[PDB]
Amino acid sequence: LISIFTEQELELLISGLPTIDIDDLKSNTEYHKYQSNSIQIQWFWRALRSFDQADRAKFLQFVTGTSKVPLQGFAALEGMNGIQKFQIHRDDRSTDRLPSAHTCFNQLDLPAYESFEKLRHMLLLAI
Amino acid sequence: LLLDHEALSCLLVLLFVDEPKLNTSRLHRVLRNLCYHAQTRHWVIRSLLSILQRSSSWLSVSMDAALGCRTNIFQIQTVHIHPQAAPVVCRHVLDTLIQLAKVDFWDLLVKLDNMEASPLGQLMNMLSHPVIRRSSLLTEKLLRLLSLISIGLTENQLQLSVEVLTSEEGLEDAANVLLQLSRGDSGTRDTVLKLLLNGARHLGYTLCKQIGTLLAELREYNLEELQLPSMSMLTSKTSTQKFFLRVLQVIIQLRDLSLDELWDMLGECLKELEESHDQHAVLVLQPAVEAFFLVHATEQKFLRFAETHRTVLNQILRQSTTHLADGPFAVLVDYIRVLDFDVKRKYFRQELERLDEGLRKEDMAVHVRRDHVFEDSYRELHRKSPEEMKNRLYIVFEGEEGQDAGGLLREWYMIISREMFNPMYALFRTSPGDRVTYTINPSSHC
């Protein structure tokens, strides 16, 4: 009966769905090869705003390795080497592969997916 | 012979006069007791059935039937019942026959005025006759009667037309009739199954026509909320969806109907409703989806359906209060990627309550000291049974004042979830990389 939940959903069942201040995440996002006005990034923020609370939580767990929200805000987001901000990296490999996460750096590698619909589908299938 | 046929006829005239005060339940118990005598029973029933067929001066009984029409129930010229009074004479006679099923008259009647299993064939023909076939009440009563008695081809056709045309209790009595008849003979089983399939195919063909109008009107609506008038004949409580689903539920109850032209256009219709950026707009096809998963997913095509409509079937289930593991969509318990988190959470909480429904749950105290709660709880509970744990715990802190037990429980649980991660118990330690997560402490052997 517990096996109906996913490994994400069991955490979300025990500790509950968090409320994500997407403005705080955006304020604590680092863009490395994308930019904050890249079209794929505007698609990213549109997608993550369009995802329900459970898919947002599953994303935060996917990229940070947890659903736990830092009490102080994502400015206090810890990583392997001290406070590490959230971060999106452009994955310069082929755009027929999923985004990939390195949660100890809170690091997202994101291929330059050609469209909102395709990026949303690939992200939703990853999370 | 306790009573003669003139005294029985005098009693039976009471079924025609509609007086609210008259105790017709007492009259039914009088007729029932009289009908323990087999010859009396047989004459009483043959007269009551002649009254139904004839529904389809001492005897001057004026019944108010409609506005400005006060009919004489009896027309003597060979005795006829004025069709305005007929539905009440039918209603009282079927009321009496339901008790006799739990357990000449005209010529005698004019002589006054001048001063189980065999007739089941007549009662099945009775469904064809207009005063009955009109009235949902008389149909429901006659079906209840047949459902009691049940414990040929036209007579089953007339029972099935009650489903292809318009009473949830009356159609559940029709389900009881058609099943208990099929329990009788393999030949009636076969003829009723194949004629149910015939009716379900008619319903399916016209349902595919209706969904074709719906889909076309959704095309014409988009290509330039949803209140498409083609939707009205699907919303209707008496919609072909509900007739088709009813018939399929009876078919599947008899199993212990080839329509890919319906199912693939239900398909493209659902896909064009979901792409049309409206959500409850699917629910006008929910019973057709439940029929699809009835005919398919026999106790694959349903899996491809639940994939390509995953978010749609989730909207269905999320809207439905039908409990996931008692309805038709229970099969997808094991293919779980096709459900939403909160759908699975609801299924969890209801199926858990189903398994533990036999347990009476009590309240149960837990007495702890604020400085030792963790070890006091270990001592008190770690030998308790799972069913004692399933009791609602209320926590008493030594000498503290009373307070709300719910807030005090939430605080107590919070304190425990903290004390879990005190290194002094050596239960859990942080990942050296993340430093905010926790996994089993490999140093708990201390």
Side-chain angles (χ1 to χ4, degrees), chain B residues 38-315:
Chain B
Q39 176 69 99
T40 289
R41 186 190 313 120
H42 191 234
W43 181 90
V44 166
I45 279 146
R46 193 166 192 134
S47 302
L48 289 165
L49 296 163
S50 84
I51 301 166
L52 290 171
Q53 289 188 40
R54 292 284 267 278
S55 203
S56 295
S57 212
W58 166 62
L59 293 188
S60 164
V61 277
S62 284
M63 169 156 314
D64 178 305
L67 197 48
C69 214
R70 188 186 218 70
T71 46
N72 304 284
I73 308 171
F74 296 104
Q75 329 290 247
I76 331 181
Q77 51 86 355
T78 188
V79 191
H80 298 295
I81 303 171
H82 203 191
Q84 309 299 347
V88 174
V89 187
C90 304
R91 188 258 304 293
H92 289 306
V93 173
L94 290 165
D95 261 326
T96 299
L97 284 173
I98 287 164
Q99 316 318 313
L100 302 184
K102 292 171 187 173
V103 177
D104 176 70
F105 162 74
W106 302 101
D107 309 290
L108 291 167
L109 173 62
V110 174
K111 170 181 287 285
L112 304 183
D113 186 52
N114 286 344
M115 294 188 280
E116 306 164 271
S118 303
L120 181 59
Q122 290 104 57
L123 290 168
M124 282 203 286
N125 197 288
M126 202 79 243
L127 294 160
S128 69
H129 298 122
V131 304
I132 302 294
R133 192 174 189 74
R134 284 169 186 144
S135 300
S136 187
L137 176 57
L138 304 175
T139 302
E140 184 274 321
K141 298 185 85 75
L142 177 59
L143 293 171
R144 186 176 294 267
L145 172 58
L146 294 166
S147 80
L148 282 161
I149 295 174
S150 292
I151 300 157
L153 274 293
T154 303
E155 292 176 3
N156 277 275
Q157 177 60 93
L158 294 169
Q159 183 55 251
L160 291 172
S161 325
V162 175
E163 291 232 73
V164 180
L165 181 139
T166 308
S167 64
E168 276 62 29
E169 58 270 37
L171 61 81
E172 191 278 325
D173 291 289
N176 192 304
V177 173
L178 289 160
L179 299 192
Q180 294 292 32
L181 269 286
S182 184
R183 307 298 165 62
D185 267 328
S186 298
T188 208
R189 174 173 73 245
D190 184 77
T191 58
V192 88
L193 255 171
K194 86 188 185 66
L195 194 56
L196 277 159
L197 299 192
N198 192 327
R201 289 180 220 225
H202 166 67
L203 293 167
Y205 285 2
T206 197
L207 180 58
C208 86
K209 200 187 71 73
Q210 293 167 0
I211 299 171
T213 73
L214 174 63
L215 202 177
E217 219 172 43
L218 289 164
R219 289 290 299 266
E220 207 48 76
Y221 170 76
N222 287 349
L223 261 286
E224 57 85 33
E225 70 173 315
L226 301 202
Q227 300 186 142
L228 290 301
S230 41
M231 196 173 286
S232 80
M233 68 174 63
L234 308 182
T235 72
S236 74
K237 318 101 195 181
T238 185
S239 187
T240 68
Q241 301 181 356
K242 285 99 179 189
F243 290 14
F244 185 50
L245 177 63
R246 265 200 294 99
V247 164
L248 292 168
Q249 288 175 13
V250 176
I251 289 157
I252 285 152
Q253 276 275 47
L254 287 177
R255 282 275 288 219
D256 64 11
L257 189 269
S258 59
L259 295 174
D260 296 343
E261 51 271 9
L262 174 70
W263 303 132
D264 313 319
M265 195 278 293
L266 173 66
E268 51 159 350
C269 189
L270 288 167
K271 193 161 296 296
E272 287 214 36
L273 291 161
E274 183 229 358
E275 78 200 10
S276 101
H277 305 147
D278 199 337
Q279 293 340 299
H280 304 70
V282 70
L283 303 167
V284 305
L285 301 174
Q286 176 193 333
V289 169
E290 288 185 40
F292 174 96
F293 291 118
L294 248 69
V295 69
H296 304 125
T298 298
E299 178 265 351
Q300 208 185 1
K301 289 192 176 185
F302 75 81
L303 202 82
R304 280 196 316 263
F305 189 109
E307 289 284 333
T308 56
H309 301 289
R310 188 198 175 287
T311 189
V312 187
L313 190 137
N314 279 276
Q315 283 180 331

Side-chain angles (χ1 to χ4, degrees), chain B residues 31-44:
Chain B
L31 292 170
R32 176 236 283 177
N33 300 337
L34 283 164
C35 288
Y36 285 126
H37 183 66
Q39 176 69 99
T40 289
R41 186 190 313 120
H42 191 234
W43 181 90
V44 166

